[PDB]
Amino acid sequence: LSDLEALRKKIEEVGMPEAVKTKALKELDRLERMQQGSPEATVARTYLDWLTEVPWSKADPEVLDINHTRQVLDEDHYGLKDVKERILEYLAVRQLTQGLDVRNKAPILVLVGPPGVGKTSLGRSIARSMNRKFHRISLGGVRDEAEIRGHRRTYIGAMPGKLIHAMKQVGVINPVILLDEIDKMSSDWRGDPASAMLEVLDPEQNNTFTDHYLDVPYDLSKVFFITTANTLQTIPRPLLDRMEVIEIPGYTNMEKQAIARQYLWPKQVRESGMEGRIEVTDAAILRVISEYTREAGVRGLERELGKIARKGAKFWLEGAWEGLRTIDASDIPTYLGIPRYRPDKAETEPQVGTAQGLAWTPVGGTLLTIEVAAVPGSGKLSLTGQLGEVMKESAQAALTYLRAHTQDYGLPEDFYNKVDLHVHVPDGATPKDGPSAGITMATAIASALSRRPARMDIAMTGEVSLRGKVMPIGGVKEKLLAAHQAGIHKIVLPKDNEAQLEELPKEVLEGLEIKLVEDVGEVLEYLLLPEP
């Protein structure tokens, strides 16, 4: 058949390394036989063709100016203005490398947070600065060690791997390969998939990687590696090491507006066809964020502005009555549709014994509207919502703290023998480890016992102390972003976290009011309209 001759002519001209030349000889030996009566060799032909187009002795060196590299990364989907410094930190590390040559010998980089952020655009900016050919292969669709490796040409089911797929359509021997959804691979075949992942991620062992489908070494040392994380608590332990975690949660109103004005909306109208006949203002984006998408990231905003751009394209195609289409938070029902959420979510007829608190999930922050039913009984505790045991410990701690004050809060003679508690949480299984809303449901119980109207729009995070203290907590930036996105402008935090606030985005501080407390007494006094 002409296939053998074509493959021989494709192999015999490309300059190839000796071991890979011998592997090409092996594959050419396989394809000696018929390629039409047995399709088990056609996939070998596809693998060879992907291997033929692998670049060799041709690479794009990075720009040696770290300052110019930062200048190029300044267009990485706007980043966060506080996460880019660690990226360019690793880049500067890559400017005084070990042995004065291109090699990692260290954790490379990672993006942790909600999937809606611009994970791919930042890697594209990295490639643009470094001049290498960007490419990505998603590992979320890979659940077995058979799509980064293969299945040797001796039985049916030898589909090509994703590694050579990235190696195929690339012009540089050292590309940047992005691996999204790294926290969903389980054990299905050939043991733990993370073992091969850590074998690849090694800067010295990647060159010594022999797949299930390959029998010779393959050059991967200089190839830059990059991954993306969604939930840090699900990634396998052999993947938590040799990995510099860069916390990149969602964006504020101002960050999202800048992304839309610089990266999102022009690209969306690129995807929708024509340009110069639509316009999106800051007020429209703010209203959409505050009324249509409360999640974290811009992918939902990507879809929304894509819908708006497609609509405007249809309006222009059906008749150009206006030079450009503008949205000013008044004609948005035609552009997008009926609103789904409620602006100012705290404006839900504030009841007597309910409080609101932050609970930053890795997919997006939420407000915990925990209600406490202080029915007059003889002392009971009904804890619903599937809440963790630490949440119950925090609840009992709040109970005894409220016990510590008899008549200060206008409480009755007793409630341990007179009040039955039925505490409900919108989702008790809080992904945030430890007590995330202990002070919140403490305030809820106090309101249910004092029986006075409570303040809304103040979302909280932290825990209580039996003598009236609050301890500092980690991940305050993510919860502050959750409050900013969820229409919350007042946040109560412990004093001890304030020293950590000098490394936060200025837009978060501008958009939020922070009133610090040291004791549960203050946070209880400032959340009920009357002190008693």
Binding residues for Mg(2+): 358, 436, 461
Q: Which stretch binds a copy of itself (CB under 8 A): 50-58, 184-192, 251-259, 481-489?
A: 184-192
- Helix (DSSP H) and strand (DSSP E) numbers for the chain: 19, 12
Could you give the 3-state DSSP secondary structure of residue 511? helix
| Least Cβ distance, residue 96 to a copy of itself (angstroms) | 3
Q: Decide the pairing of beta strands 364-376 and 134-136.
A: unpaired
**Is residue 479 among the annotated active site residues?**
yes
Could you give the 3-state DSSP secondary structure of residue 127? helix
- 78 touches which of a copy of itself, ligand ADP, none (CB within 5 to 8 A by kind)? ligand ADP
Interface with a copy of itself (CB under 8 A), residue from 20, 397, 459, 460: 397
* Positions that interact with ligand ADP (CB under 6 A): 76-78, 115-122, 259, 263, 297-299
**Is residue 222 among the annotated active site residues?**
no
User: Could you say which of 436, 447, 450, 490 is catalytic?
Assistant: 436
Task: Give me the amino acid identity at 305.
Answer: L
Tokens of 65: 């100016």
Task: Give me the amino acid identity at 191.
Answer: G
Edge-to-edge strand list for the sheet holding 458-460: 458-460, 490-492, 513-514
Tell me which H or E stretch contains 394: helix 389-404
Q: Which of 442, 332, 349 minimizes the C-alpha distance to 395?
A: 442
Q: Interface with a copy of itself includes 93 (CB under 8 A)?
A: yes
DSSP code per residue over 66-94: HHHHHHHHTTSTT--SSSHHHHHHHHHHT
Report the alpha-carbon distance of residue 247 to residue 461 in Å, rounded. 19
Q: Interface with a copy of itself includes 271 (CB under 8 A)?
A: yes
- 233 touches which of ligand ADP, a copy of itself, none (CB within 5 to 8 A by kind)? none
Give the E-state strand segments of 48-207 in sequence order.
134-136, 176-179
Interface with a copy of itself (CB under 8 A), residue from 500, 506, 515, 518: 500
Nearer to ligand ADP, 118 or 175 (CB): 118
Q: Interface with a copy of itself includes 98 (CB under 8 A)?
A: yes
Give binding residues as ranges.
77-79, 113-121, 124, 136, 237, 251, 267, 299, 302, 358, 436, 461
Tell me which H or E stretch contains 22: helix 18-30
Q: Residues 460, 437: contact at Cβ < 8 Å?
A: yes
- 431 touches which of a copy of itself, ligand ADP, none (CB within 5 to 8 A by kind)? none
Tokens of 445: 């119980």
Report the alpha-carbon distance of residue 127 to residue 69 in Å, rounded. 10
Q: Interface with a copy of itself includes 96 (CB under 8 A)?
A: yes
Q: Interface with a copy of itself includes 506 (CB under 8 A)?
A: no
Nearer to ligand ADP, 125 or 369 (CB): 125
Nearer to ligand ADP, 226 or 449 (CB): 226
Q: Residues 482, 364: contact at Cβ < 8 Å?
A: yes
| Least Cβ distance, residue 432 to a copy of itself (angstroms) | 17
Q: Interface with a copy of itself includes 158 (CB under 8 A)?
A: yes
- 118 touches which of ligand ADP, a copy of itself, none (CB within 5 to 8 A by kind)? ligand ADP
Q: Interface with a copy of itself includes 525 (CB under 8 A)?
A: no
Name which of residues 418 to 437 contact a copy of itself (CB under 8 A). Answer: 420, 422, 424, 428
Tokens of 223: 């190839």
In the stretch 196-235, what mask flags binding to a copy of itself with x, by CB under 8 A? ----------------------------------------
User: Could you say which of 23, 256, 477, 479 is catalytic?
Assistant: 479
Report the alpha-carbon distance of residue 436 to residue 431 in Å, rounded. 9
Q: In this structure, what are the phi and psi dihedrals at residue 365, rounded to the nearest 5 degrees?
A: -70, 155
Interface with a copy of itself (CB under 8 A), residue from 14, 286, 363, 466: 466
Q: Residues 331, 311: contact at Cβ < 8 Å?
A: no
| Least Cβ distance, residue 155 to a copy of itself (angstroms) | 5
DSSP category for residue 174: S
Q: Interface with a copy of itself includes 327 (CB under 8 A)?
A: no
Interface with a copy of itself (CB under 8 A), residue from 36, 57, 186, 233: 36
Active-site residue set: 436, 479
